């Protein structure tokens, strides 16, 4: 229903099609489709905090055209 952006530290922006009720886990799955990055290797950051997989975009007040920041993890 809406799109959000995911920005890396390397200057790349990824556009995702999402629903307000999508979980962070599902967002990470969508990033895997675009980038090939497994969800366990993704840290997503918004409003100065790392996002937990079980909550939704709505729970974190992530709205249409918001930008998340992606950092890889090991």
């Amino acid at each position: 229903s809406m799109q959000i952006f995911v920005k890396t530290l390397t200057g790349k922006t990824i556009t995702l099609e999402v629903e307000p009720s999508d979980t962070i886990e599902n967002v990470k799955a969508k990033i895997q489709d675009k980038e090939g990055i497994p969800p366990d290797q993704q840290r997503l950051i918004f409003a100065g905090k790392q996002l937990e997989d079980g909550r939704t975009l709505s729970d974190y007040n992530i709205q249409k055209e918001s930008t998340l920041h992606l950092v890889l993890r090991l």
Binding site: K7, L9, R43, I45, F46, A47, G48, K49, Q50, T67, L68, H69, L70, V71, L72, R73, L74
Partner: peptide, 20 residues
């Protein structure tokens, strides 16, 4: 690798706070 990750986390946190 581990210290690079921790600094990258800090940078993303700061970039996301500045945008808020």
């Amino acid at each position: 690798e581990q210290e690079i990750e921790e600094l990258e986390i800090e940078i993303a946190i700061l970039l996301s706070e500045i945008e808020g």
